[PDB]
């Protein structure tokens, strides 16, 4: 488990305390999170538990939906999309119109009674240790505060230290926008309460937050709702949190007992022993991947200045830091047994956050988990798998209540209560492909891990999704294909006064992949030979990929792209086949790839943080390193990245962080088809470097080293053996490896050889 870079190269640091939330630094263990401001005399730690949402179990299905569905479908086939959207909002959409928001737990307040003559201030976050440290000089003493969240102890650990005796004096309190009661003793604090209502859905959750002090020296007392510590030698605060949430339909947990159990269990330990356990668990996952894109003197600059000055072309390491920040954030927001990374990971200080900070699944949640497999963090996918089994249940209800159809269906959003209906507005959400796109991540887990028992476990999910579309696909009267109706291209207006339509190109691409996967699983598992044969015939009937009058790949069945209202729409939904899919690629479909390149050129480069991140991956797939680097400059910029390196929609949306990590990876290594492509989109700004521990499909890992803009060496390690193909700059090399063996590759007189 060797380190993956120099200690300096993986730290975010600043010369001043934070003035805004988007300057505070995040720590987390997958389910318990904290934002650290680094205050000197008055410090605030803003906390989250990843099951604290408003409301309770509910059913937003509209009882009017199934009745009005045939008329919406007939209006769309008649080309009266504005009337169909109006009718859909009236009768089809969910009631209530909104889903439930992710909400903050509270803030830990640390108020020291003196801070005289401050010098040499530094607050930092070390990605290798997941510790937020604040340090300064006061008088003759060095004062230090360290915060981290351990997945083993399931506690936030806060240590207040000073290199002179009797220098820790403060009070400790809890502040929260949630209702409840705080009880305070010398022995510690407890904050117990219930969540609130939202959109008429009453709050049925209970929560508990506990604060336990461990004081060496001084006096420990209690005043009002706060702990008081006078002239102590060292203080360690341990914090645990939980809710009563058990399932989307079950809220009978005991957060009071669970938090107390974790505290007394963890209180039996010593801080060096606490630290060794946290470092071991965190570093077993973080140190799996090492990346080096170059080093400069700019590594000495504080992180905020690096973001402001990255456009100077003199700080290659900031791209590598951004890459590892996404791997870090996925580790800290999505561990096995926790909730999936929502729109903000787990970090949120707003009771009514933007778009409820839930799971928007017409691009954003998918982008969150894009970097998982290639960056050796497939265990972080477990929450998505668990959520998808939940959506199999609720989505079955939705499929039968809205469409009177078998199988299961999900639209463009879901929350902690796993609702699967369309919400907000038909022009954004009347889109039945949410489950299909989320399932693409599970297919990658099969294709990367090749665990046959896993495929057996996840196949019923793919079957049920296929069954829904077998029953819902319709013959299109203008084109003659089997299409979806009602649907939409997220989230674009077509040239005829609405967004709803029949068989948008994204639906055809998603179902082409879904049906191919169901057929391949039927052969690999020896079941459902029939239905797989009919999925093949139904697959041929889907709307085909088409090239329009401007040489562009068509977003809709009809050649509408050049007369669409917003030519630079942030969504590029019809380019899904070029990325994240490889259905369209430069090798196997050169014409359609050139048409997708033309469509991407017509859309333009600038958009939201996630829109920029999607364009980064697309240009990486097109093997254009210089354009991909130009997109990366737009992503890592004062317009789209906060001083704490958070991605900006704006405001903060964690999707762009994960998409940027995946796009940087895609520029250096790609794995699709039967091949592995080496440095397909390497930009001139990265002439030398290395990457180690990347994963490819077929159960293998790759290490890469390059110099002068040219490949120097690569190592392919196969776990169980198999045949592979390496491709570099148009040259291919067919290999065969045994289980647990390594094949080194290199360049000899400009030829790719072993």
The beta-strand segments (E) located in 16-140 are 25-28, 32-36, 42-49, 106-112, 118-126, 131-138
Is 222 or 712 the residue whose CB approaches its own copies more closely? Answer: 222
Contacting residue, 70, 224, 312, 530, with its own copies by CB under 8 A: 224
Please report whether residue 638 would count as binding its own copies according to CB under 8 A.
Answer: no
Q: Are 493 and 566 in contact (CB under 8 A)?
A: yes
- Helices 505-525 and 529-540 pack at an angle, to 10 degrees, of 150
Please report whether residue 49 would count as binding Ca ion according to CB under 5 A.
Answer: no
* Residue 541 CB burial class (10 angstroms; 0-12, 13-18, ≥19): middle
**C-alpha to C-alpha distances, 197 to 57, 200, 349, 498, nearest whole angstrom:** 12, 6, 17, 33
**C-alpha to C-alpha distances, 587 to 349, 505, 548, nearest whole angstrom:** 47, 21, 21
Q: Which does 16 bind (CB under 5 to 8 A by kind): Ca ion, its own copies, none?
A: its own copies
Q: Which does 540 bind (CB under 5 to 8 A by kind): Ca ion, its own copies, none?
A: none
Is 26 or 548 the residue whose CB approaches its own copies more closely? Answer: 26
Q: How far is the CB of 116 from its own copies (least distance, A)?
A: 6
* Residue 563 CB burial class (10 angstroms; 0-12, 13-18, ≥19): exposed
Q: How far is the CB of 444 from Ca ion (least distance, A)?
A: 20
**Helix and strand tally (H, E) in the chain?**
17, 32
Q: How far is the CB of 27 from its own copies (least distance, A)?
A: 19
Contacting residue, 1, 3, 7, 114, with its own copies by CB under 8 A: 114
Pick the stretch among 94-102, 113-121, 434-442, 510-518 that binds its own copies (CB under 8 A).
Answer: 113-121
Please report whether residue 338 would count as binding Ca ion according to CB under 5 A.
Answer: yes
Q: How far apart are CA 495 and CA 642, in angstroms?
A: 36
What is the CB neighbour count within 10 angstroms for residue 14?
Answer: 21
Contact pattern from residue 25 through residue 54 relative to its own copies, giving x for each residue in contact according to CB under 8 A and a dash for the rest: --------------xxxx-x----------
User: φ and ψ at 539, to 5 degrees?
Assistant: -70, -40
Q: Are 510 and 576 in contact (CB under 8 A)?
A: yes
What are the tokens at 712?
A: 């120097």
Q: How far apart are CA 99 and CA 419, in angstroms?
A: 8
Pick the stretch among 2-10, 67-75, 114-122, 702-710 that binds its own copies (CB under 8 A).
Answer: 114-122
Contacting residue, 9, 10, 14, 21, with its own copies by CB under 8 A: 21
What are the tokens at 35?
A: 């934002």
Strand partners, 143: 136, 162
Please report whether residue 20 would count as binding its own copies according to CB under 8 A.
Answer: yes
Q: Are 329 and 345 in contact (CB under 8 A)?
A: yes
Contacting residue, 339, 429, 487, 617, with Ca ion by CB under 5 A: 339
Report the run of H or E that residue 519 belongs to, with start and end: helix 505-525
Closest C-alpha to 366, from 424, 321, 410, 425? 410
Strand partners, 243: 207
DSSP string computed for 142-200: EEEEEEEEETTTTEEEEEEEESSTT-EEEEEEEE-SS--EEEEETTEEEEEEE---BTT
Contact pattern from residue 160 through residue 199 relative to its own copies, giving x for each residue in contact according to CB under 8 A and a dash for the rest: -----------x-x-x-x-xxxx-----------------
Q: Which does 165 bind (CB under 5 to 8 A by kind): Ca ion, its own copies, none?
A: none
Q: How far apart are CA 631 and CA 625, in angstroms?
A: 10
Q: Which does 651 bind (CB under 5 to 8 A by kind): Ca ion, its own copies, none?
A: its own copies
For Cα atoms 649, 650, 652, give the angle at the middle one, nearest 5 degrees.
Answer: 80
Alpha helices in 403-475 (DSSP H): 426-429, 434-449, 452-472
Q: How far is the CB of 413 from its own copies (least distance, A)?
A: 21
Q: How far apart are CA 468 and CA 511, in angstroms?
A: 11
Q: Which does 312 bind (CB under 5 to 8 A by kind): its own copies, Ca ion, none?
A: none
DSSP string computed for 590-611: HHHHHHHHHHHHHH-S---HHH
Pick the stretch among 106-114, 239-247, 498-506, 535-543 that binds its own copies (CB under 8 A).
Answer: 106-114
Q: Please give the radius of gyration of the chain, using alpha carbons only, rounded to the nearest integer.
A: 27
Residues 295-334 that bind Ca ion (CB under 5 A): 333
Please report whether residue 50 would count as binding Ca ion according to CB under 5 A.
Answer: yes
Is 231 or 562 the residue whose CB approaches its own copies more closely? Answer: 231
Please report whether residue 120 would count as binding its own copies according to CB under 8 A.
Answer: no
Q: Which does 339 bind (CB under 5 to 8 A by kind): its own copies, Ca ion, none?
A: Ca ion
Q: Which does 475 bind (CB under 5 to 8 A by kind): Ca ion, its own copies, none?
A: none
**C-alpha to C-alpha distances, 685 to 248, 295, 314, 559, 692, nearest whole angstrom:** 48, 12, 9, 38, 20
Residues 641-660 that bind its own copies (CB under 8 A): 650-651
Pick the stretch among 116-124, 146-154, 488-496, 663-671 that binds its own copies (CB under 8 A).
Answer: 116-124
Q: How far apart are CA 40 and CA 144, in angstroms?
A: 10
Please report whether residue 220 would count as binding its own copies according to CB under 8 A.
Answer: no
Count CA atoms closer than 13 A to 424's CA, side-chain side.
16
Contacting residue, 1, 74, 223, 753, with its own copies by CB under 8 A: 223
Please report whether residue 244 would count as binding Ca ion according to CB under 5 A.
Answer: no
At residue 38, the 3 state secondary structure works out as coil
User: φ and ψ at 530, to 5 degrees?
Assistant: -60, 160
Pick the stretch among 49-57, 306-314, 436-444, 707-715 that binds Ca ion (CB under 5 A).
Answer: 49-57
Contacting residue, 63, 70, 116, 549, with its own copies by CB under 8 A: 116
Please report whether residue 141 would count as binding its own copies according to CB under 8 A.
Answer: no
Q: Which does 175 bind (CB under 5 to 8 A by kind): its own copies, Ca ion, none?
A: its own copies
Q: Which does 338 bind (CB under 5 to 8 A by kind): its own copies, Ca ion, none?
A: Ca ion
Q: Which does 17 bind (CB under 5 to 8 A by kind): Ca ion, its own copies, none?
A: its own copies
Q: How far is the CB of 132 from Ca ion (least distance, A)?
A: 18
Please report whether residue 17 would count as binding its own copies according to CB under 8 A.
Answer: yes
Q: Which does 42 bind (CB under 5 to 8 A by kind): Ca ion, its own copies, none?
A: its own copies
Q: How far is the CB of 657 from Ca ion (least distance, A)?
A: 15
Q: Which does 179 bind (CB under 5 to 8 A by kind): Ca ion, its own copies, none?
A: its own copies
Please give the size of the binding site for its own copies, defined by CB under 8 A: 34
CA 93 to chain centre: 27
What's the full length of the chain, in residues?
754
Contact pattern from residue 322 through residue 361 relative to its own copies, giving x for each residue in contact according to CB under 8 A and a dash for the rest: ----------------------------xx----------
Residues 21-40 that bind Ca ion (CB under 5 A): 31
Please report whether residue 305 would count as binding its own copies according to CB under 8 A.
Answer: no
Interface with Ca ion by CB under 5 A: which residues?
Answer: 31, 50, 333, 338-339, 346
Interface with its own copies by CB under 8 A: which residues?
Answer: 16-17, 19-21, 39-42, 44, 109, 111, 113-118, 171, 173, 175, 177, 179-182, 223-226, 350-351, 650-651
């Amino acid at each position: 488990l060797p380190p993956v870079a120099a200690a300096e190269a993986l730290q975010l640091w600043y010369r001043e305390p934070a003035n805004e939330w988007v300057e505070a630094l995040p720590v987390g263990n997958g389910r318990l999170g904290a934002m650290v401001w680094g205050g000197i005399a008055h410090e605030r730690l803003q906390l989250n538990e990843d099951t604290l949402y408003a409301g309770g179990p509910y059913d937003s299905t509209s009882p009017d939906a199934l009745a009005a569905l045939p008329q919406v479908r007939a209006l769309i086939f008649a080309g009266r999309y504005a009337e169909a959207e109006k009718l859909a909002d009236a009768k089809l959409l969910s009631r209530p119109l909104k889903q439930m928001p992710y909400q903050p737990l509270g803030d830990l307040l640390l108020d020291f009674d003196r801070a005289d003559g401050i010098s040499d201030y530094r607050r930092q976050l070390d990605l290798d240790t997941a510790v937020a440290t604040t340090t300064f000089r006061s008088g003759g003493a060095v004062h230090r505060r360290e915060v981290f969240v351990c997945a083993q102890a399931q506690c936030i650990v806060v240590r207040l230290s000073c290199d002179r005796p009797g220098g820790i004096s403060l009070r400790v309190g809890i502040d929260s926008p949630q209702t409840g009661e705080v009880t305070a003793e010398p022995g510690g604090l407890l904050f117990s309460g219930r969540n609130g209502s939202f959109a008429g859905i009453e709050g049925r959750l209970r929560f508990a937050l506990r604060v336990l002090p461990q004081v060496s020296g001084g006096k420990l007392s209690q005043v009002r709702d706060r702990l008081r510590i006078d002239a102590a030698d060292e203080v360690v605060l341990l914090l645990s949190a939980a809710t009563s949430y058990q399932r989307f339909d079950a809220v009978d947990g005991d957060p009071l007992a669970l938090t107390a159990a974790r505290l007394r269990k963890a209180a039996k330990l010593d801080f060096p022993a606490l630290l060794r356990a946290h470092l071991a668990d965190h570093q077993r996952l973080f140190r799996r991947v090492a990346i080096d894109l170059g080093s400069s003197e700019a590594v000495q600059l504080p992180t905020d200045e690096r973001v402001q000055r990255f456009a100077e072309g003199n700080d290659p390491a900031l791209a590598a830091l951004y890459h590892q920040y996404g791997r870090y954030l996925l580790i800290c927001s999505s561990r096995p047994g926790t909730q999936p990374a929502n729109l903000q990971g787990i970090w949120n200080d707003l009771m009514q956050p933007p778009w409820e900070s839930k799971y928007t699944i017409n691009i954003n949640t998918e982008m969150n988990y894009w970097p998982s497999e290639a960056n050796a963090l497939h265990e972080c996918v477990e929450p998505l798998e668990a959520m998808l089994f939940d959506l199999a249940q609720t989505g079955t209800h939705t499929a039968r209540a809205i469409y009177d159809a078998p199988g299961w269906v999900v639209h463009n959003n879901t929350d902690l209560w796993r609702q699967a209906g369309p919400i907000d507005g038909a022009q954004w959400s009347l889109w039945p492909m949410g489950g299909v796109w989320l399932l693409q991540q599970l297919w990658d887990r099969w294709d990367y891990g090749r665990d046959r028992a896993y495929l057996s476990k996840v196949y019923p999910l793919f079957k049920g999704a296929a069954e829904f579309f077998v029953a819902t696909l319709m013959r299109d009267p203008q084109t003659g294909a089997m299409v979806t109706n009602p649907s939409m291209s997220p989230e674009n207006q077509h040239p005829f006064g609405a967004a709803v339509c029949a068989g948008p190109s994204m639906d055809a691409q998603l179902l082409r992949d879904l049906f191919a996967q169901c057929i391949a699983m039927s052969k690999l598992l020896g079941i459902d030979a029939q239905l797989a044969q009919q999925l093949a015939a139904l697959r041929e009937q889907l709307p085909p990929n088409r090239i329009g009058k401007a040489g562009q790949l068509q977003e809709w069945q009809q050649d509408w792209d050049m007369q669409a209202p917003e030519i630079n729409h942030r969504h590029v939904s019809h380019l899904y086949a070029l990325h994240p899919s490889s259905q369209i690629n430069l090798r196997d479909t050169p014409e359609l790839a050139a048409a997708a390149r033309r469509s991407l050129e017509i859309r333009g480069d600038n958009a939201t943080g996630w829109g920029i991140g999607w364009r980064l991956n697309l240009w990486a797939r097109l093997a254009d390193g210089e354009h991909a680097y130009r997109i990366l400059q737009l992503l890592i910029s004062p317009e789209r990245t906060y001083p704490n390196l958070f991605d900006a929609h704006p405001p903060f949306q964690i999707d762009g962080n994960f998409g940027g990590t995946a796009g940087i990876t895609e520029m250096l290594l790609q794995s699709w088809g039967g091949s592995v492509f080496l440095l397909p989109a390497l930009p001139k700004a990265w002439p030398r470097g290395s990457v180690r521990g990347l994963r490819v499909r077929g159960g293998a890992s790759v290490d890469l080293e390059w110099e002068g803009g040219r490949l120097q060496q690569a190592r392919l390690h196969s776990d169980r053996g198999g045949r592979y193909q390496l491709s570099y700059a148009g040259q291919t090399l067919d290999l065969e490896l045994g289980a647990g063996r390594t094949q080194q590759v290199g360049l000899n007189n400009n030829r790719l050889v072993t």
